[PDB]
A paper describes a structure:
Eleven [name]-related protein kinases (NEKs) are expressed in humans. At the protein level, it has been shown that [name] stabilizes the complex between ATR (ATM and Rad3-related) and ATRIP (ATR interacting protein) through phosphorylation, priming this complex for Chk1 phosphorylation. In this work we report the structure of the human [name] kinase domain in its apo form and in complex with an ATP-mimetic inhibitor. Overall, our structural model of the kinase domain will help the design of [name]-specific inhibitors as potential anticancer drugs and other [name] reported diseases.
Author numbering: -20 to -17, -10 to 10, 17 to 284
Write the structure that this text describes.
């Protein structure tokens, strides 16, 4: 300490467990030196964050760390060292829904299979949205299958608030296919922007393709705003086709809430396959949250 700051590196840990890097997949597949079990670690740089970016990152990790649901990838722990934050998540051995969709090689899924997966995604999102939390990454690449076939929404991507410009930017660089009309017009990100993205995923499960595609980023934006997409096979029920259309309403407030999706009979009847009576009572009836504290 003789300057023109030593001791300002963040050190945080909760356990002695050590992880060996296996492969990049800012995500790394690792193996525990304790018992060889595999996990995914997401590395986030912290040293070059402003004071505000750090307080928000902290608040996001705390939310990640407290999320527990059978259809959300289980957080294990986090640690900080060497100017980075590392978040340790369970590894879903079945891989992501994006690969599962391509594995079909054009063979449409059975409607029962679609809806059994979809209900699980909805249960996950209900849990997140009930707490007034957004999820910036409802995408097939971020929904996974466990070894026993359970669908899990990736925990990474939950957010306490989102900037419409930043999300638009992230999309022009990463994946643009889940952009909602409002984000395309630089209007505020909201819970129904998540519902749009959920719709894109359902559409992918119904058709094996993205709903909105175009030869340029600027024209993809215009096609999303127009709300015009190739219809789902009429082989699927009117209930399912009807839902798809509701999820792609242009005005966010015209899209159904996730509660509203789950109360639809053809979906409601499946919930008991995935939640116990106690969790159903807690999730749907008893535990209430509000934008008032
Ligand atoms: Cl199938
Ligand atoms: Cl995750
Ligand atoms: Cl609206
Ligand atoms: Cl909602």
């Amino acid at each position: 300490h003789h300057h023109h700051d030593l001791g300002t590196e963040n050190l945080y840990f909760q356990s002695m467990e050590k992880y060996v890097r296996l492969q990049k997949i800012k995500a790394i597949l690792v193996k525990s030196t304790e018992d060889g079990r595999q996990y995914v670690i997401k590395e986030i740089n912290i040293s070059r964050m402003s004071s505000k970016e750090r307080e928000e990152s902290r608040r996001e990790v705390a939310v990640l760390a407290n999320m527990k649901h059978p259809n959300i990838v289980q957080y294990r722990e986090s640690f900080e060292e060497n100017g980075s934050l590392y978040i340790v998540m369970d590894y879903c051995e079945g891989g992501d829904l994006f690969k599962r969709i391509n594995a079909q090689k054009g063979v449409l899924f059975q409607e029962d299979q679609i809806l059994d997966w979809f209900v699980q995604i909805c249960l996950a999102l209900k849990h997140v949205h009930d707490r007034k939390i957004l999820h910036r990454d409802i995408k097939s690449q971020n929904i996974f299958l466990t070894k026993d076939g359970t669908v899990q929404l990736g925990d990474f991507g939950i957010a306490r608030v989102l900037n419409s410009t930043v999300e638009l930017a992230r999309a022009c660089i990463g994946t643009p296919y889940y952009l909602s009309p409002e984000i395309c017009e630089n209007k505020p990100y909201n819970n129904k922007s998540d519902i749009w993205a959920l719709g894109c995923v359902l559409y992918e499960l119904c058709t094996l393709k993205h709903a909105f595609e175009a030869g340029s980023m600027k024209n993809l934006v215009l096609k999303i705003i127009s709300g015009s997409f190739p219809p789902v096979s009429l082989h699927y029920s009117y209930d399912l086709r009807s839902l798809v259309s509701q999820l792609f309403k242009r005005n966010p407030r015209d899209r159904p809430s996730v509660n509203s999706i789950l109360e639809k009979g053809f979906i409601a009847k499946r919930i008991e396959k995935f939640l116990s009576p106690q969790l159903i009572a807690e999730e749907f009836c008893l535990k209430t949250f509000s934008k008032f504290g």
